[PDB]
């Protein structure tokens, strides 16, 4: 995903942009999802960066993924 | 917990008619998974035809006349499954529960000194208290002292009567396997290669005797011999060779006309 | 009763979740132990599966471990001195995990004398290092060669009270086990305690 916000302490918001197909019109539409991801202090990513995230146990109300690699 | 099993919800391989009853016998917990097993009552009533209904099946089973892996089992809901040896001493019946090419359960007749041998795929290896290595098999058996070369995915050929391991066949390329799950269940082939995807399902690419290449997940393969020529267990009539559907239909039609 | 589900919580959008089922026993919570310092009193709690938790209401002693010495002793809890959640827990002498306590230093002092032949209580029932076999004296020298004790713990042993951190959960197991504070962690908490006398 792409880093969308880094305003939280050790938590970042990423975006997953994708195209959804509509069968009737034989055409796509742009959709996106937002995921709260824990970010270890060993990475320091920025807005617009691309990150790889791995699924972990629930770490908060919304967090289910941990940052693994910053590209 | 769930105690019933609707006949529509029952596995299709049990071949129970949708019109004859609402329910099917729910397998109890035990050696094999509920979706991957054949109940003893189904074996004694629907397959062997020794019992006309469940009440006669109860008559046979409660007396301990049916042995599974050299042990009388009195429950019609006992979940018999793959590679199990079922013996009825009174009628002199001995067969192994295997899969044919079409994925259905098959009763492959066995001779003596063959019903004493059963293959078990190692699914887990752990350490028990006292630093005792324990191997867990596909049929729920726990082995207190397996061979030091034993690995997960390997198969242990195991003497049921004497309750001891006698040989081990490693899970490597070039070994003969039988598929126990998926669309390729019942096919017999040789391991060409195994693709490893850590954190996901490993994929085994196999090749049968005729040269057909197929694949499945590594959990569905079951090593049964060093290679296709020397198997360590008797296999069903069709020898795990999938046969073209058009050719099969033509051969059946010709055979039917030859009969009449 | 008390529940642990997310149904009553607001969605991230701020909308209200419309609940369409009754509360389940599988999501229940229990009232806190609020274990205090005092003579031992526990209450068993039958948990899911038939297992028992021990809800400690009062505790007075526990197994406290000297990590650098790889030893532990059953010692009496003397006071609660610091709690990172609030100082009200200190005021009420509540025993929870990670809180800082002061425990009797006598068993640790006595073990040091027996194991190393060094009596920390110099300059003023009690083990005497003089009554030792010559073999034990040689083992004392062997142990003493590769050994250096820190002055902070050594001073605390001399005064008879040594600070420790609770490592168990009294509300779940009914125990007040802990580990003696050492090194930087002790210096951190000593500064916290030094604040405001």
């Amino acid at each position: 995903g792409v880093v969308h916000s880094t305003k939280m302490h050790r938590t970042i918001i990423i975006r997953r942009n994708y195209l959804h197909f509509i069968k009737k019109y034989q055409r796509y539409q742009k959709r996106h999802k937002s995921l709260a991801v824990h970010c270890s202090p060993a990475f320091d990513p920025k807005q617009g960066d691309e990150v790889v995230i791995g699924q972990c146990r629930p770490l908060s109300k919304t967090i289910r993924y941990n940052v693994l690699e910053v590209v | 917990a769930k105690k019933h099993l609707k006949r529509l919800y029952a596995p299709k391989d049990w071949m129970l008619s949708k019109l004859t009853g609402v329910f099917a016998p729910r397998p109890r917990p035990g050696p094999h998974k509920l979706r991957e097993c054949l109940p003893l009552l189904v074996i004694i009533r629907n397959r062997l035809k020794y019992a006309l209904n469940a009440r006669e099946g109860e008559m046979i089973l409660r007396q301990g006349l049916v042995h599974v892996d050299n042990h009388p089992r009195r429950d019609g809901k006992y979940p018999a499954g793959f590679m199990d040896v079922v013996e009825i001493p009174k009628t002199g019946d001995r067969f192994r529960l295997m899969y044919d090419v079409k994925g259905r359960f098959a009763l492959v007749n066995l001779s003596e000194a063959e019903a004493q041998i059963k293959l078990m795929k190692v699914v887990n290896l752990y350490t028990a208290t006292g630093r005792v290595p324990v191997a867990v098999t596909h049929d729920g058996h726990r082995i207190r002292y397996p061979d030091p070369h034993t690995s997960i995915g390997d198969t242990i050929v195991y003497n049921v009567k004497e309750k001891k391991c006698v040989d081990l066949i490693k899970n490597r390329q070039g070994k003969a396997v039988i598929v126990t799950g998926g669309a390729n269940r019942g096919r017999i082939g040789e391991i060409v290669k195994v693709e490893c995807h850590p954190g996901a399902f490993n994929i085994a690419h196999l090749k049968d005797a005729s040269g057909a290449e197929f694949a499945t997940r590594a959990a569905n393969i079951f090593v049964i011999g060093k290679d296709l020529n020397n198997l360590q267990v008797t296999v069903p009539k069709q020898q795990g060779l999938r046969m073209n559907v058009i050719q099969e239909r033509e051969e059946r039609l010709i055979a039917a006309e030859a009969r009449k | 009763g008390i529940v642990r589900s997310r149904l009553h919580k607001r969605k991230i959008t701020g909308g209200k979740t419309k609940i369409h089922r009754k509360r389940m026993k599988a999501e229940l919570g229990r009232l806190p132990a609020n274990t205090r310092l005092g003579a031992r009193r526990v209450s068993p709690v039958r948990a899911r599966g038939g297992n028992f938790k021990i809800r400690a209401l009062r505790l007075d002693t526990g197994n406290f471990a000297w990590a650098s010495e790889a030893i532990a002793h059953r010692v009496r809890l003397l006071d609660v001195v610091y709690n990172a959640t609030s100082n009200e827990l200190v005021r009420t002498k509540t025993l929870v995990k990670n809180c800082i306590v002061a425990v009797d230093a006598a068993p640790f002092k006595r073990w040091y004398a027996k194991h190393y032949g060094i009596d920390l209580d110099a300059d003023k029932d009690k083990y005497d290092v003089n009554k030792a076999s010559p073999k034990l004296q040689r083992e004392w020298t062997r142990r003493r060669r590769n050994h250096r004790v820190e002055k902070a713990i050594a001073d605390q042993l001399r005064e008879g009270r040594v600070l420790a951190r609770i490592t168990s959960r009294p509300g779940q197991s009914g125990r007040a086990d802990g580990i003696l504070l050492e090194g930087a962690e002790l210096q951190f908490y000593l500064k916290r305690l030094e604040k405001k006398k």
């Binding site: - | 529509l8 949708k18 019109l19 609402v22 559907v245 058009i246 239909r249 | -």
Partner: protein, 183 residues
Amino acid sequence: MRNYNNFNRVWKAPRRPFEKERLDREMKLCGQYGLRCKREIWRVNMTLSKMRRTARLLLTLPENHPRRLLEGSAIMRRCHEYGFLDEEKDKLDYVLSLTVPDILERRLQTIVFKAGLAKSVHHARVLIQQRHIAVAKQIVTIPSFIVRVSSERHIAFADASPFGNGRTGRVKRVRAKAAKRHA
């Protein structure tokens, strides 16, 4: 409740209720083959509609397609067995040319009249419904019985029928009882 016995329809009404050409054609078919209602023609119409639909689907596919090979062989075998198409016509395109009279000629009511066991199609139907005709020694009482080519030579009077090897019929039996009682 909890009954899983399947059932389905075998006929469909025509789209336009009143067409002079269609009504006259169906009236001709009813008289020619001794049918009871238009539903018997419409049943044949739906059958042919199904066969032509799968034939069109198969012919869309390329020749070497396994589904076309297996399904195409099966339907041609079905047509040859039931006499819908001649043995010479061995192409899938000839299924498309099947007509309603082709199916109607294979009815046991039609075959019995054509074989010569009945004076007319109406005589044939009542003979079938009155347990007088057997196909391979099995009594058949359904006029819409589609006769296989291999079964054509085995059509004859039933052994249990008075016209075959059976006992006397109602008229003679009742008169025999009356003669005994009157005497």
